[PDB]
Design a protein around this ligand. Structure first.
Ligand SMILES: Cc1cc2nc3c(=O)[nH]c(=O)nc-3n(C[C@H](O)[C@H](O)[C@H](O)COP(=O)(O)OP(=O)(O)OC[C@H]3O[C@@H](n4cnc5c(N)ncnc54)[C@H](O)[C@@H]3O)c2cc1C
Ligand SMILES: CCCCCCCCO[C@@H]1O[C@H](CO)[C@@H](O)[C@H](O)[C@H]1O
Ligand SMILES: CCCCCCCCO[C@@H]1O[C@H](CO)[C@@H](O)[C@H](O)[C@H]1O
Ligand SMILES: CCCCCCCCO[C@@H]1O[C@H](CO)[C@@H](O)[C@H](O)[C@H]1O
Ligand SMILES: CCCCCCCCO[C@@H]1O[C@H](CO)[C@@H](O)[C@H](O)[C@H]1O
Ligand SMILES: O=S(=O)(O)CCCNC(CO)(CO)CO
Ligand SMILES: O=C(O)[C@H](CO)OP(=O)(O)O
Length: 495
């Protein structure tokens, strides 16, 4: 023993969040991630902690109420990476009558417990707005932005903090019951180092891969189909200077967001495209671009073309197959399935599960796993504060506090540290007292002290883990800057 209580296969948000909860109820936990933390669906989201306004139409009150209540729990768990945002809904009476918006916005206000977040209001649009002349009315309400990939990272660190282990670049190849225990086989994707562990419990939280892990990894029947529903986002220099997001009603009845991103960009997403194939292959297609530019350009005065696009990303939603004919109508609710064999070796397996609802999901999963452990502590995460979160304030509150303590910090660098690392910033900065104490400037104030900290504390192994997942510095570093980051990581992860 050697025998872990629980193996979690999966390090997106649902695997990390399950493993974090388990470790904090006393279980020995190993979370296995085939590639990098959040390398798939959990870094390809719209980055919102939202209730799911559009899901009210489809009468999804269990999900929408749970997700609304979670916005505020998540704001306190991670105030370094999560924050309130306001969403502007332009009125399109030919699509949805005002009286209908007002009922939904009323429900959005009261279906979950809502202290901090303001309520909705009506809006008018003048000759001087960002929107087209003919659009005269709208609405405004609350929801939250989160740094998806950093929420995943925070949870992995919670695992380790609480005594668990987390292996990345380690692909589970098989899992089988023997003699009352799981035998989990995994393998290092680079070297080829084989591993084998026994555990009392197995979570299959492999997102879009959940059913193919049943088929190829376990030779067991999957309790559910998964529908893979691709969505893509485009990125442009910001379309306007407003702080608020816009949520646009399209002719097909879907909604599309224009979201301020990192003070310089806007994100426009997303799409619902039925998908077959390898979830790692997923990338935006021409018609997704055409579709997103269109709904933008029909609403807004400042027009965008294709040539304005600076970045795109794409991902596949692993949606519990409710056999719904239309991809936009398939449920965004999750399903968890627990099964033992002779009252021992449970298999908990995860189907669906928005980032918003992950802490709820993790909790229910441990609920179902309780019978098979001791011994096991109770629920606890609602009242936790994830690593990085111990700041109380943020928005220079923490960044100004840091520039105070570390006066050689530029205001941009302190904002970045505060909004990325939070309360882990002093750990990064160590014994630095000047800028040259930070080491090699890799570009855009991305210094060797940040990159080394990422390797030492954040499982960074390759340039992209650092530049696209733990941060979004890859938005500013040029091709040679990025390969120097890779070159450095080679030298340091030698050796
Ligand atoms: C376009 C889009 C926009 C979205 N926007 C939002 C939003 O705004 N708000 C919100 O709350 N949610 C949003 N979501 C939903 C959310 O992103 C997903 O539900 C969530 O990220 C899925 O996480 P997961 O852990 O279940 O899957 P993942 O963690 O992403 O997938 C499983 C992970 O485990 C690893 N893995 C897989 N198989 C193995 C194996 N065999 N062995 C070892 N490791 C393995 C992978 O390498 C993979 O990264 C969005 C989703 C999409 C697609
Ligand atoms: C009891 C009468 C039934 C009315 C259904 C209420 C749900 C309305 O939901 C509405 O539609 C869209 C998607 O949900 C959103 O864009 C709107 O803002 C939202 O209010
Ligand atoms: C006469 C215009 C009143 C409101 C100012 C902006 C116009 C767009 O608002 C309109 O108001 C209607 C009443 O006719 C609502 O029922 C509709 O949903 C909408 O078409
Ligand atoms: C937020 C107010 C309580 C909700 C009551 C539903 C009445 C909304 O009804 C709508 O009101 C709009 C603005 O007056 C009008 O433009 C529309 O014609 C009307 O359908
Ligand atoms: C089939 C789906 C349509 C059902 C809606 C009822 C039709 C009446 O239509 C609307 O109803 C609202 C409340 O019902 C009122 O506030 C509006 O003033 C009225 O225009
Ligand atoms: O700092 S934490 O303790 O929260 C996580 C530390 C992880 N360190 C690794 C360094 O090799 C990953 O970066 C692996 O244990
Ligand atoms: O653009 C979006 O938000 C869509 C549907 O309009 O998807 P989802 O609900 O999965 O995030």
């Amino acid at each position: 023993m050697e025998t872990k209580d629980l193996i979690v296969i999966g390090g997106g948000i649902n695997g990390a969040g399950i493993a974090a909860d388990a470790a904090g109820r006393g279980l020995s936990v190993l979370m296995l991630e085939a590639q990098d933390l959040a390398c798939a669906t959990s870094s390809a989201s719209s980055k919102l902690i939202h209730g799911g306004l559009r899901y009210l139409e489809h009468y999804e009150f269990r999900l929408v109420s749970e997700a609304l209540a979670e916005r505020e729990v998540l704001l306190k768990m991670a105030p370094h990476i999560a924050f309130p945002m306001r969403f502007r809904l332009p009125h399109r009476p030919h699509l949805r009558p005002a009286w209908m918006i007002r009922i939904g916005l009323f429900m959005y206000d009261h279906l979950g417990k809502r202290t901090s977040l303001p309520g909705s209001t009506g809006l008018r649009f003048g000759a001087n707005s960002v929107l087209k002349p003919e659009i005269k009315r709208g609405f405004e309400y609350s929801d939250c932005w989160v740094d998806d990939a950093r929420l995943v990272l925070a949870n992995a660190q919670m695992v380790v903090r609480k005594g668990g282990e987390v292996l990345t670049r380690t692909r589970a190849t098989s899992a089988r019951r023997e003699n009352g225990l799981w035998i989990v086989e995994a393998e290092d994707i680079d070297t080829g180092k084989k591993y084998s562990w026994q555990a009392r419990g197995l979570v299959n939280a492999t997102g879009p891969w959940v059913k193919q892990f049943f088929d190829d990894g376990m030779h067991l029947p999957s309790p559910y189909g998964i529908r893979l529903i691709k969505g893509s986002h485009i990125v442009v220099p910001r379309v306007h200077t407003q702080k608020q997001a816009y949520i646009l009603q399209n002719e097909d009845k879907r909604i599309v967001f224009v979201i301020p991103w990192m003070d310089e960009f806007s994100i426009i997403g997303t799409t619902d495209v039925e998908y077959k194939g390898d979830p790692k292959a997923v990338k935006i297609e021409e018609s997704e671009i055409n579709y997103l530019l269109n709904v933008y350009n029909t609403h807004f005065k400042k027009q965008l073309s294709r040539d304005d696009i600076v970045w795109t990303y794409s991902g596949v939603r692993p949606l519990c197959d409710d056999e719904s004919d239309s991809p936009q109508a398939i449920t965004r609710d999750y399903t968890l399935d627990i099964h033992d064999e002779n009252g021992k070796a449970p298999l908990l397996s995860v189907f669906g599960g928005k980032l918003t609802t992950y802490r709820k999901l993790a909790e229910h999963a441990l609920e179902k796993l309780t019978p098979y452990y001791q011994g096991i502590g109770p629920a606890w995460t609602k009242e936790s504060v994830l690593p990085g979160g111990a700041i109380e304030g943020d928005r220079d509150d923490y960044a100004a506090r840091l520039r105070r303590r570390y006066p050689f910090l530029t205001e941009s660098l302190a904002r970045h540290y505060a909004r990325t690392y939070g309360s882990n910033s002093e750990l990064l900065l160590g014994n630095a007292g000047t800028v040259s104490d930070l080491g090699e400037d890799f570009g855009h104030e991305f210094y060797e002290a940040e990159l080394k900290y990422l390797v030492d504390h954040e499982w960074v192994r390759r340039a992209d883990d650092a530049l696209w997942r733990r941060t979004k510095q890859g938005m500013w570093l040029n091709a040679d800057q990025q390969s120097r980051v890779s070159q450095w990581l080679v030298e340091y992860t030698q050796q």
